[PDB]
Design an enzyme around this catalytic site. Structure first.
Site, PDB file in Angstrom:
ATOM      1  N   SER A  51       0.745  -1.104   0.224  1.00 18.96           N
ATOM      2  CA  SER A  51      -0.187   0.011   0.054  1.00 18.96           C
ATOM      3  C   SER A  51       0.926   1.276  -0.164  1.00 18.96           C
ATOM      4  O   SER A  51       0.243   2.250  -0.267  1.00 18.96           O
ATOM      5  CB  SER A  51      -1.031  -0.002   1.123  1.00 18.96           C
ATOM      6  OG  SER A  51      -1.930  -1.024   1.114  1.00 18.96           O
ATOM      7  N   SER A  98      -6.382   2.630   3.646  1.00 20.07           N
ATOM      8  CA  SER A  98      -5.706   1.707   2.796  1.00 20.07           C
ATOM      9  C   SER A  98      -6.657   0.930   1.974  1.00 20.07           C
ATOM     10  O   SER A  98      -6.471  -0.187   1.627  1.00 20.07           O
ATOM     11  CB  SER A  98      -4.917   0.964   3.631  1.00 20.07           C
ATOM     12  OG  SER A  98      -3.500   0.778   3.055  1.00 20.07           O
ATOM     13  N   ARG A 231       3.734  -1.349  13.540  1.00 21.90           N
ATOM     14  CA  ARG A 231       4.245  -0.657  12.743  1.00 21.90           C
ATOM     15  C   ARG A 231       4.835   0.571  13.027  1.00 21.90           C
ATOM     16  O   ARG A 231       5.598   1.395  13.292  1.00 21.90           O
ATOM     17  CB  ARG A 231       3.944  -0.821  11.268  1.00 21.90           C
ATOM     18  CG  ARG A 231       4.118  -2.121  10.480  1.00 21.90           C
ATOM     19  CD  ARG A 231       3.187  -2.299   9.265  1.00 21.90           C
ATOM     20  NE  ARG A 231       1.863  -1.836   9.875  1.00 21.90           N
ATOM     21  CZ  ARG A 231       0.775  -1.562   8.928  1.00 21.90           C
ATOM     22  NH1 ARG A 231       0.954  -1.924   7.637  1.00 21.90           N
ATOM     23  NH2 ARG A 231      -0.525  -1.465   9.476  1.00 21.90           N
TER      24      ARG A 231
END
Ligand SMILES: *C(=O)[C@@H]([C@@H]1NC(C(=O)O)=C(S[C@@H]2CN[C@H](C(=O)N(C)C)C2)[C@@H]1C)[C@@H](C)O
Length: 245
Positions: A51, A98, A231
């Site tokens: 993405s 996303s 993340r």
């Protein structure tokens, strides 16, 4: 300023160690590239952008008039992998969520021919998009290295890409993910699920109160049944450990 580089290195590594993953975060201060994490050699290995490619997809789309800032992409009403994708949205909401189906719509409008030449022009990763205009950033053959990703973020942060300034701004405004201590973080996350092993990304930059822009790119292995949060948490911990935020 008093923390040893040895200590910075160990803390950032441990962030990756504590997620039980393997990864690297590249940080660029000016022209100086710095590599951290528990798997330093990932830095110049090639992964699918997943993405992360949305950012270039949006630049290409908007520059070549395949969409606008305000245009609402209608949900076709088929079931989606996530219920939050089953609505009408702008490019900007698609970016935050996303929502690949939207970015595939945009890739389709752009078309293979114009996509290939635009990705050659920008010299993004290995620059090969193959013959399938709608998944080339998901399963190959487009690949890019963490070093290349932070350099693209640097390019975008500074308006250096070969697109209009208005185009670059429009896409940047879509990328705000966090404000912390008068610093703004602009980034795009990535989770390539159609490759073994799975790759995770968070590519972007910190815009400090003072005005300087500090690009980074986190890149790690996702093990299924692992949270996408990791993340962000690793990135934020690292940026704070280095006093960047
Ligand atoms: C892009 O890499 C893929 C999508 N990217 C992400 C991501 O970067 O986190 C996801 S996860 C999807 C988005 N937010 C959802 C969520 O966290 N909730 C259900 C609350 C899940 C996708 C895998 C794109 C190519 O599919």
């Amino acid at each position: 300023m008093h923390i040893s580089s040895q200590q910075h290195e160990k803390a950032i590594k441990s962030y990756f160690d504590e997620a039980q993953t393997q990864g690297v975060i590249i940080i660029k201060e000016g022209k100086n590239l710095s590599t951290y994490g528990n798997a330093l050699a990932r830095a110049n290995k090639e992964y699918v952008p997943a993405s992360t490619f949305d950012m270039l997809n949006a630049l290409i789309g908007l520059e070549n008039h395949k969409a606008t800032t305000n245009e609402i992409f209608k949900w076709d009403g088929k079931k989606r992998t996530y219920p939050m994708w089953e609505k009408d949205m702008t490019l900007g909401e698609a970016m935050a969520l996303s929502a690949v189906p939207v970015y595939q719509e945009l890739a389709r409008r752009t078309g293979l021919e114009l996509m290939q030449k635009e990705v050659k022009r920008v010299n993004f990763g290995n620059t090969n998009i193959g013959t399938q205009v709608d998944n080339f950033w998901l399963v190959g053959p487009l690949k890019i290295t963490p070093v290349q990703e932070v350099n693209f973020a640097d390019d975008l942060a500074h308006n250096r890409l070969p697109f209009k300034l208005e185009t670059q701004e429009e896409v940047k405004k879509m990328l705000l993910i966090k404000e912390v201590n008068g610093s703004k973080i602009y980034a795009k996350s990535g989770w390539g699920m159609g490759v073994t092993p799975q790759v995770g990304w968070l590519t972007g930059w910190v815009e400090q109160a003072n005005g300087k822009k500090i690009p980074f790119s986190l890149n790690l292995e996702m093990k299924e049944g692992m949270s996408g949060s990791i993340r962000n948490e690793i990135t934020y911990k690292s940026l704070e450990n280095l006093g960047i935020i």
